[PDB]
């Protein structure tokens, strides 16, 4: 098992990291041999001398974007939605001529034409919301340029549940979390659960996520390390998913619809072929790349899930930092939850270390 050496990789990699970056509390999950190994460090709340714990809730950030893609995927599975219906079909109010050739896949994959990163703070209700989209002007034409945006995949998820009849929080729970037994994952932490909610730490000061349009769909979800480990396992070895639609939903989200040179876009998920050079992955996670308008080459039809990929996603909030990755061919993957926001390339460096040590 190398459980003794494996629990040594953990220590020897995150401890110099926590102090190198002033990290208060961290929680790690490794899935080596289909068995999750949790390791907890630092404090959840130093103000109250609370340490970190497997039940401890961290903010997931845009890693929530993965739930969206499967929420949306399981939905395609039921044949409620299709990856090519015009957006216009599930929300005919958008009457702007500019919206014409935009599909659901576009919104699902930052492909629509330059939809903003952040939804305007100015935007506070459905009418100002429809205004914004209706006024919006793409710089590029659909299916040509990929620019990572909340405004793109949020609305996708928002509409993606429409034919269900149940609001996002509902569907998301009823169709994904419960079946997968993710009984401590939260869009809205219960009062009874709040005790498990930690604090994020910014300019010395302590903060948490704050409400805003399409948040749930973009950075809502809050959960503990245990559930993150189960989440990962269901995505890596999906065959074991009891429910049919979900299983396919997991399929579809890891399929590949566009190519952005070295990487491949999926629903929520991001994938590089395995094996892949660390510098490649790490480099591409720097914000001078990740938030960049980059041309895109399409796969038609969308290649189905390839075993030998690096599928992953970074995620951040005001005071939180998270990161997940896992090579599905080689039964392993890791989970790093931190109550702080620190440089993406730093998260993915450390992972690689610990991960390629499992080989
Ligand atoms: B995610 O990458 O962590 C992410 C992307 C875009 C925006 C957010 N958050 C907000 O705009 C509000 I902290 C998270």
From TrEMBL:
<dbReference type="InterPro" id="IPR058136">
    <property type="entry name" value="AmpC"/>
</dbReference>
<keyword id="KW-0046">Antibiotic resistance</keyword>
<dbReference type="GO" id="GO:0046677">
    <property type="term" value="P:response to antibiotic"/>
</dbReference>
<dbReference type="GO" id="GO:0030288">
    <property type="term" value="C:outer membrane-bounded periplasmic space"/>
</dbReference>
<dbReference type="GO" id="GO:0008800">
    <property type="term" value="F:beta-lactamase activity"/>
</dbReference>
<dbReference type="InterPro" id="IPR058142">
    <property type="entry name" value="AmpC_enterobacter"/>
</dbReference>
<feature type="domain" description="Beta-lactamase-related">
    <location>
        <begin position="10"/>
        <end position="358"/>
    </location>
</feature>
<keyword id="KW-0732">Signal</keyword>
<comment type="similarity">
    <text>Belongs to the class-C beta-lactamase family.</text>
</comment>
<dbReference type="GO" id="GO:0017001">
    <property type="term" value="P:antibiotic catabolic process"/>
</dbReference>
<protein>
    <recommendedName>
        <fullName>Beta-lactamase</fullName>
        <ecNumber>3.5.2.6</ecNumber>
    </recommendedName>
</protein>
<dbReference type="Pfam" id="PF00144">
    <property type="entry name" value="Beta-lactamase"/>
</dbReference>
<dbReference type="InterPro" id="IPR012338">
    <property type="entry name" value="Beta-lactam/transpept-like"/>
</dbReference>
<dbReference type="InterPro" id="IPR001586">
    <property type="entry name" value="Beta-lactam_class-C_AS"/>
</dbReference>
<keyword id="KW-0378">Hydrolase</keyword>
<dbReference type="InterPro" id="IPR050491">
    <property type="entry name" value="AmpC-like"/>
</dbReference>
<dbReference type="InterPro" id="IPR001466">
    <property type="entry name" value="Beta-lactam-related"/>
</dbReference>
């Amino acid at each position: 098992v190398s459980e003794k050496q494996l629990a040594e990789v953990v220590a020897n990699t995150v401890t110099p990291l926590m102090k190198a970056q002033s990290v208060p509390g961290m929680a790690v999950a490794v899935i080596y041999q289909g068995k999750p190994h949790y390791y907890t460090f630092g404090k959840a709340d130093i103000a109250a001398n609370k340490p970190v714990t497997p039940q401890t809730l961290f903010e997931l950030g845009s890693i929530s974007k993965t739930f969206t893609g499967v929420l949306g995927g399981d939905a395609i599975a039921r044949g409620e939605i299709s990856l090519d219906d015009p957006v216009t079909r599930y929300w005919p109010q958008l009457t702007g001529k500019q919206w014409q050739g935009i599909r659901m896949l576009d919104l699902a994959t930052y492909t629509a034409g330059g939809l903003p990163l952040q939804v305007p703070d100015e935007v506070t209700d459905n009418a100002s919301l429809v205004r914004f989209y209706q006024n919006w002007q793409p710089q590029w034409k659909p299916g040509t340029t990929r620019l990572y945006a909340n405004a793109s995949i949020g609305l996708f998820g928002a509409l993606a549940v429409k034919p269900s009849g149940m609001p996002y929080e509902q569907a998301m729970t009823t169709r994904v979390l419960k079946p997968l037994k993710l009984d401590h994952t939260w869009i809205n932490v219960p009062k009874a659960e709040e005790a498990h909610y930690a604090w994020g730490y910014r300019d010395g000061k302590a903060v948490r996520v704050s409400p805003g349009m399409l948040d749930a769909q973009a950075y809502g979800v809050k959960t503990n390390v245990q559930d993150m480990a189960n989440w990962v396992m269901a995505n890596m070895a999906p065959e074991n998913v009891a429910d049919a639609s979900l299983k396919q939903g997991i399929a579809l989200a890891q399929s590949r619809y566009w190519r952005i040179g070295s990487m491949y876009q999926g629903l929520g998920w991001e994938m590089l072929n395995w094996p892949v050079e660390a510098n490649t992955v790490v480099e591409g996670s720097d914000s001078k790349v990740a938030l960049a308008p980059l041309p895109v080459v399409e796969v038609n039809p969308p290649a189905p899930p390839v075993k030998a990929s690096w599928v992953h996603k970074t995620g951040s909030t005001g005071g939180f930092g998270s990161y997940v990755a896992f090579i599905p061919e080689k039964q392993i993957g890791i989970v790093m939850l931190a109550n702080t926001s620190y440089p993406n390339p730093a998260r993915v460096e450390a992972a690689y270390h610990i991960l390629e040590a499992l080989q």
